[PDB]
């Protein structure tokens, strides 16, 4: 059985790096992280000093 | 990093109050609840005494 | 077996009341109305005296 | 010909009132506003004192 | 309030049995599992000895 | 001209058998049933003794 | 209250004429037909002598 | 950079002519109109003397 | 078994004729073309002398 | 690089067996078939002696 | 009230840089640009010397 | 007439480079490659030494 958690990563550099940010967090806390699916991308502009790229991913991990 | 939990709130009054019901529950258990996105709405009719409005939300919270 | 009918309710007050308007009509004519799923919402503005909220629902009823 | 503008209204009270907030703004600036279609709903939680309901609408107006 | 978890069940027999595999896991760990909604189906072919059917479900459970 | 009715079939055995349950009902009441399209699948768990698979279909029939 | 019926019209000439074919049928049988929304288009090729254009519409009519 | 405007064209003749009606309007007011994408089609029936076909398009134009 | 190919037909006349253009091409090269499903429509404007209607279809053909 | 082909399998028994029918065909003709994603399911009723279940899959295979 | 404009940015380098190109244009002409949502990505290949990445964004700005 | 092939490119560097990987393959084998549309993005994590970014594209090429 796989389970997915819905995470939004952020980066001041790129959408790829924002996806990595989410996956990094998942790997900090979860065992057996196997894949991620991108479900949304966006950019935070008018509440931050530097534009912040965001990539939202379903991160899948194998249970047990 | 943000994480989302997929919650269905209920209310005998309105779709807005049903969204609040879910958000209330998220705030009981989670720190740093930041926003919610409505993903579905519905009404339970033939198993309840009063119609029950339901609003399903992705509730986003900031990790750490 | 459940069957759904696709109804648009209207209200001069709210999207919740517009959903109720559709469900009310379904219950006038159908037995065993069990639930409704919201599939669209809108507002009629420039053909009415008062703005009219509309909520379109699939209203499910149990056959037999 | 109709044209649509994509507006997000806000309210501290309800999703209906948030839709009205967008439509109100459209009517301030545009002639011949005819209808609105709801395309998203959400709630701002962790940057505001009171939860703020948001309803995003395509607001249609007749050209000429 | 209902909460949903996004689980992918697997089976070497059928899509139905794969849905059951996910639901079985949810019932092992959660109280008050009430329904599941199928959100994706697929088949693993070229990393397994036998084709493996997969059914991804949102499994809903009642909180409290 | 074809018309479609939106039916949810149920089965304690499989998603295929649940689709058949809906189609069976359509054929009881309608002439010239020609095809069905699956539009949703789900499982009822916590209100039934045995898990109940559900398959929702648009069932198309030829008018006249 | 509006209700919609899901009809597929056909024509050997065009997608517009196929939409009209469905609407024509709705007007034969229903009072107060108000609008139609196109939801699918297709072409039947290898079971007919002439290609047959099909347009599927939700046809809305006002109840009462 | 391209920008899109969301326009609904109308015609008493066809969906193609309705798309042209929107594009015609865009070309009256905008420079560098490059393409259009159809996003919806419909038919106005019970407020007009003749059925009116509607085609909604995103009309893209090049900025600068 | 059916297979589909994803083709975009073009026409200076209509969306119907653009669908036919794709189907014509499929029939030139494939045996047992059975149906087509429209998946997108658009108009090329600012790289052509005459507006060019486009209809993208999945064209289904029976294998063997 | 992976490539996908869009195949509809058929079976007089089940949606699972219909998916297998498509995958079987892909494996007859292609090397390195790795997975399939279900994209549609349906049932042929009024042109066949026995109901025929259909499962449409994107079948992915590794190039080279 | 927020309003969104639908812009396609381009870059010969990356999808991130293409999103920035659109946002840059929005900030040239609009006050109070707050966020962007990615709605499509693509690549222009056979009309340009170098591949051109494109990212289409809804760019949101606060009115007043 | 344009035809599209559905390709998934991979890269250990970025989603942009993964799109290029698919397009590169298309250009190796096909004449008149004109554009690509991104339809999915993902990351392979727990079967590879380095995370592998994937971008799935419909790659369009002009026939004849
Ligand atoms: C992808 C994305 C979507 C957003 N959507 C909204 C929104 O719908 N409403 C909102 O108030 N702020 C939204 N924001 C945040 C906004 O830019 C700003 O930080 C808030 O307005 C602060 O209250 C969004 C930010 C991002 C990156
Ligand atoms: C939005 C919504 C969707 C529902 N969908 C289903 C369904 O697909 N099948 C079902 O058995 N009950 C469904 N129900 C519950 C139904 O109204 C009733 O309580 C059940 O039939 C009890 O078994 C739904 C209820 C709501 C509020
Ligand atoms: C949600 C909604 C969508 C509508 N869409 C359309 C449309 O696409 N075309 C149209 O002519 N009128 C539309 N109308 C009706 C419009 O406001 C007006 O009453 C008509 O233009 C009368 O011919 C719509 C009304 C609502 C509430
Ligand atoms: C519907 C909605 C969606 C939002 N989405 C995002 C988002 O994707 N990323 C984000 O940083 N903030 C988002 N926000 C704003 C968030 O709540 C907070 O104000 C920001 O994090 C401030 O930077 C959203 C707010 C709303 C109401
Ligand atoms: C429904 C489904 C979707 C899949 N999608 C992908 C994918 O997008 N990329 C991938 O590398 N592997 C995918 N795989 C796994 C693939 O079959 C194989 O196990 C991997 O390529 C191993 O690295 C998928 C498997 C299934 C069952
Ligand atoms: C596919 C499916 C979806 C359902 N969705 C809901 C729902 O959204 N809300 C709800 O109260 N019950 C729902 N139910 C019914 C639920 O399992 C239980 O019978 C009800 O909670 C009884 O009130 C659903 C059942 C099925 C099979
Ligand atoms: C838009 C459209 C979709 C169709 N889809 C299917 C299908 O999924 N399976 C099928 O057997 N026939 C389908 N047909 C019918 C097909 O062309 C042929 O008449 C049947 O194969 C006869 O059994 C479709 C026809 C049209 C016009
Ligand atoms: C595509 C389309 C969609 C429409 N949707 C609606 C609607 O949702 N509600 C409505 O009141 N009128 C709608 N109308 C207008 C309707 O036919 C009639 O003109 C209005 O009811 C006048 O108030 C629509 C018209 C078209 C062409
Ligand atoms: C339906 C449709 C969609 C198009 N989308 C794009 C696009 O996203 N980007 C683009 O550069 N050109 C696009 N074009 C082509 C555009 O009109 C023009 O020919 C190109 O800009 C040439 O580089 C599109 C054309 C059509 C018909
Ligand atoms: C999933 C599915 C979808 C279909 N859709 C259509 C359709 O849209 N139009 C049609 O004429 N036949 C359709 N058919 C075929 C239909 O049942 C019958 O064989 C044809 O009407 C023969 O011309 C479909 C069959 C299946 C299995
Ligand atoms: C994302 C994207 C989508 C496009 N879609 C189309 C299309 O549907 N039809 C078309 O003629 N050109 C399209 N083009 C443009 C195409 O590559 C080429 O420039 C045109 O064919 C010039 O007429 C597209 C370009 C891009 C980047
Ligand atoms: C975007 C993406 C989606 C995937 N989906 C699945 C899946 O649904 N099931 C699966 O078994 N593996 C999937 N995989 C592959 C998975 O990470 C691992 O390689 C396989 O589990 C090997 O059997 C996917 C990989 C990617 C990159
Ligand atoms: Cl989710
Ligand atoms: Cl329907
Ligand atoms: Cl495809
Ligand atoms: Cl838009
Ligand atoms: Mg930096
Ligand atoms: Mg988002
Ligand atoms: Mg009360
Ligand atoms: Mg739901
Ligand atoms: Mg009042
Ligand atoms: Mg509507
Ligand atoms: Mg207040
Ligand atoms: Mg939104
Ligand atoms: Mg076995
Ligand atoms: Mg999946
Ligand atoms: Mg049994
Ligand atoms: Mg359902
Ligand atoms: Mg003729
Ligand atoms: Mg169809
Ligand atoms: Mg005329
Ligand atoms: Mg519309
Ligand atoms: Mg001509
Ligand atoms: Mg397209
Ligand atoms: Mg048999
Ligand atoms: Mg299909
Ligand atoms: Mg360069
Ligand atoms: Mg695009
Ligand atoms: Mg490297
Ligand atoms: Mg994918
Ligand atoms: Na989730
Ligand atoms: Na219906
Ligand atoms: Na817009
Ligand atoms: Na394809």
Comparing CB atoms, the residue among G15, G16, G34 nearest residue H45 is G34
Residue L53 near residue L40 (C-beta atoms within 8 A): no
* F37: closest CA of chain E, how far (Å): 15
Contact yes or no for B62/B32 (Cβ under 8 A): yes
- Cα R_g (chain F), whole angstroms: 12
DSSP strands (E only) in D1-64: 2-11, 33-44, 52-62
Q: What is the resolution in angstroms? A: 1.6
Chains that touch B (3 or more CB pairs under 8 A): A, C, D, E
Fold (CATH) for J1-64: Dodecin subunit-like (3.30.1660)
Q: Is A10 on the interface with B (CB under 8 A)?
A: yes
Q: Strand, helix or coil at B13? A: coil
**3-state class (DSSP) for residue J5:** strand
Ligand 24 centre from D42 Cα, in Å?
Answer: 7
Instruction: Identify whether the C-beta of residue J57 lies closer than 8 Å to the C-beta of residue J36.
Output: yes
Q: Are strands G2-11 and G52-62 parallel, antiparallel or unpaired?
A: antiparallel
Residues with CB under 6 A from ligand 12: A 34-35, 37; E 8, 42, 44, 47, 54; L 42-44, 46-47, 54
Protein residue whose Cα sits closest to atom 23 of ligand 4: A47
Rounded CA separation F2/A1 (Å): 41
Find tokens 């395309």 and name the residue: D39
Q: What residues have CB less than 8 Å from J41, skipping those under 6 apart?
A: F19, F37, F38, J15, J18, J53, J54, J55, J56
- Report the atom number in ligand 5 closest to the C-alpha of E54: 27
d(CA J56, CA I6) in angstroms, rounded, equals 15
Looking at CA atoms only, how far is residue H46 from chain I in angstroms?
26
Give the separation between CA L4 and CA K51, rounded to whole angstroms. Answer: 18
Quick check: CB of K55 below 6 Å from ligand 9?
A: no
Exposed e or buried b for every residue in B38-59, given b needs 16+ CB within 10 A? bbebbbbbeeeeebbbbbbbbb
Residue tagged 């909220």 (tokens): C53
Buried b (16+ CB within 10 A) or exposed e, C37-49: bbbebbbbbeeee
Residue with tokens 């507002």: C43
DSSP conformation class of G31: S
Residue of F38, F39, F43, F40 lying closest to F11 (CA atoms): F43
Which chain A residues are within 8 Å of K35, Cβ to Cβ?
A: 42-46
Q: Is I50 helix (H, G, I), strand (E, B) or coil?
A: coil
Residue B50: what are its φ and ψ, rounded to 5°?
-110, 140
Task: Compute CA distances J38 → E56, I62, J55, whole Å.
Answer: 11, 19, 7
The residues, any chain, with a CB within 8 Å of residue I31's CB and separated by 6 or more, are I61
Q: How far apart are the first and last CA of chain F?
A: 8
**I49 marked as binding residue:** no
Contact at 8 Å (CB) between K57 and A43? yes
Rounded to whole angstroms, what are the CA distances from J16 to J11, J53, L17? 9, 9, 36
Asked whether L14 and L55 are in contact (CB, 8 A), the reply is no
- I14 φ, ψ (degrees, to nearest 5): -160, 165
Q: What is the DSSP string of chain L?
A: -EEEEEEEEEESS-HHHHHHHHHHHHHHH-S-EEEEEEEEEEEE-TTSSS-EEEEEEEEEEE--
K56 to B46, F54, K9, K15, L6: CA distances (angstroms): 45, 39, 6, 9, 21
Report CB contact under 8 Å: K60, D21: no
Which residues does K4 contact at the CB level (< 8 Å), separation at least 6? D6, D7, D8, K37, K58, K59, K60, K61
Instruction: Check if H45 contacts G (Cβ < 8 Å).
Output: yes
Q: How many angstroms separate the CA of residue E62 from the nearest CA in chain J?
A: 30
| Closest residue CA from atom 9 of ligand 11 | I44
Q: Which residues contact B31 (CB under 8 A, 6 or more apart)?
A: B61
Question: Could you give the dihedral angle defined by the CA atoms of residues H58, D35, B11 and C37, in that order, rounded to the nearest 10 degrees?
Answer: -60
Backbone phi and psi for residue I9, each to the nearest 5 degrees, phi listed first = -90, 155
In angstroms, the CA L21 to CA L17 distance is 6
CA atoms of K34 and E29, how far apart (whole Å):
42
Nearest CA in chain L to A19: L43
From the number of C-beta atoms within 10 Å of its C-beta (0-12, 13-18, 19+), residue K49 rates as exposed
I56: annotated binding-site residue? yes
Instruction: Give φ, ψ of J58 to 5 degrees.
Output: -80, 115
C-alpha triplet F53, F55, F57: angle, nearest 5°? 165
Nearest CA in chain F to G55: F1
Question: How far apart are the two ends of chain C, measured CA to CA in Å?
Answer: 8
Compute chain C's Rg from CA coordinates: 12
Q: Which of J44, J45, J53 lies nearest to residue F16, judging by beta carbons?
A: J53
Distance CA C35, CA I23 (A): 43
CA distance K16 to K23: 11
Q: Is the CB of C41 under 6 A from ligand 8?
A: no
What does DSSP assign to residue H63? -
Dihedral in degrees, nearest 10, Cα atoms A12, D39, F7, E21: 20
- Ligand 12: residue whose CA is nearest its atom 12: E44
Nearest residue of chain D to residue C41 (CA atoms): D38
Under 8 Å CB-to-CB from E48, ≥6 apart: which residues?
none
Distance spanning both ends of chain D, measured CA to CA? 8
Q: Mutate which of F3, F7, F9, F61 to disrupt the C interface (most C C-beta within 10 Å)?
A: F7
Question: Using CB atoms within 10 A of its CB, is residue B30 exposed (0-12), middle (13-18) or buried (19+)?
Answer: middle
The position carrying tokens 């459970």 is E61
Task: Choose the closest CB to J43 out of F19, F32, F62.
Answer: F19
Contacts of E6 in chain A (CB under 8 A): 3-4, 6, 58
- Structural contact between residues E56 and E6, judged by C-beta atoms closer than 8 angstroms: yes
Euclidean distance between CA atoms E35 and C35, whole angstroms: 15
User: Does the beta carbon of C36 lie under 8 angstroms from any beta carbon of chain G?
Assistant: no
d(CA H25, CA H9): 8
From I2's Cα to the closest Cα of chain L, the distance in A is 17
- Does any ligand 1 atom lie closer than 6 A to the CB of residue D27? no
Closest to E20 measured CA to CA, from E2, E38, E4: E38
Question: C60, C33 in Cβ contact below 8 A?
Answer: yes
Give the closest residue to D13 by CA, choosing from L17, C16, H52, C12.
Answer: C16
Residue bearing the CA closest to ligand 11, atom 14? L35
**Are A64 and A1 spatial neighbours (Cβ–Cβ below 8 Å)?**
yes
Helices (H), ranges, E1-64: 15-29
- Could you tell me if B3 lies within 8 Å of chain A, comparing CB atoms? yes
- The C-alpha R_g of chain D, in whole angstroms, comes to 12
* Contact status of H60 with chain D (Cβ, < 8 Å): no
The Cβ of residue I47 has, within 10 Å, a number of other Cβ atoms equal to 9
Whole-angstrom Cα distance, residue C15 to residue C42? 8
Tokens of residue D25, six digits: 């703004």
Pair of tokens at residue F10: 């149920």
Q: What's the angle, vertex CA G55, arms to CA F23 and CA I29, rounded to 5?
A: 95
Per CB-CB distance under 8 Å, the chain A contacts of E25 are 1, 63
Task: Give the residue from D31, D34, D30, D23 showing the smallest Cα distance to D56.
Answer: D23
Q: How far is the centre of ligand 18, averaged over its atoms, from the C-alpha of G39 (Å)?
A: 26
Distance, CA of J36 to CA of J27 (rounded, Å): 11
Count CB neighbours of F50 within 10 A: 9
The finding on whether C11 has its CB within 6 A of some atom of ligand 8 is: no
Q: Is I44 on the interface with H (CB under 8 A)?
A: yes
- Decide whether any atom of ligand 10 lies within 6 Å of the G52 Cβ: no
Rg of chain H over Cα atoms, rounded to whole angstroms, equals: 12
Tokens of residue E54, six digits: 């997969």
> What tokens does F50 get?
């045995």
> How far apart are alpha carbons D60 and D1 in whole angstroms?
10
Task: List, in order, residues 6 or more apart from E57 with CB less than 8 Å away.
Answer: E6, E7, E8, E9, E19, E22, E23, E36, E37, E38, E39, F43
Ligand 6 in reach of F55 Cβ (< 6 A): no
Neighbours of E20 (CB within 10 A): 20
Solved with: X-ray
Query: Residue K1: CB within 6 Å of ligand 9?
Result: no
3-state secondary structure of F25: helix
Q: How far apart, in whole angstroms, are the C-alpha atoms of residue L4 and residue L57?
A: 9
Rounded distance between C-alpha atoms, residue E56 and residue E51, angstroms = 16
Ligand 6 atom nearest E34 alpha carbon: 17
Is A12 annotated among the ligand-binding residues? no
CA distance linking residue B58 with residue D32, whole number of Å: 36
Cα distance from H29 to chain D (closest Cα, Å)? 12
Residue A43 CA to residue C14 CA, distance in Å, equals 33
Closest C-alpha to D7, from C30, D15, D24: D24
H47 lines ligand 3 (CB under 6 A): yes
């Amino acid at each position: 059985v796989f389970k997915k958690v819905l995470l939004t990563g952020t980066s001041e550099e790129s959408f790829t790096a924002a996806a990595d940010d989410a996956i990094d967090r998942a790997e900090d806390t979860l065992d057996n992280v196997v894949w991620a699916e991108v479900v949304d991308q966006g950019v935070e502009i008018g509440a931050v000093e530097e534009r912040t790229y965001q990539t939202e991913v379903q991160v899948a991990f194998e249970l047990d």
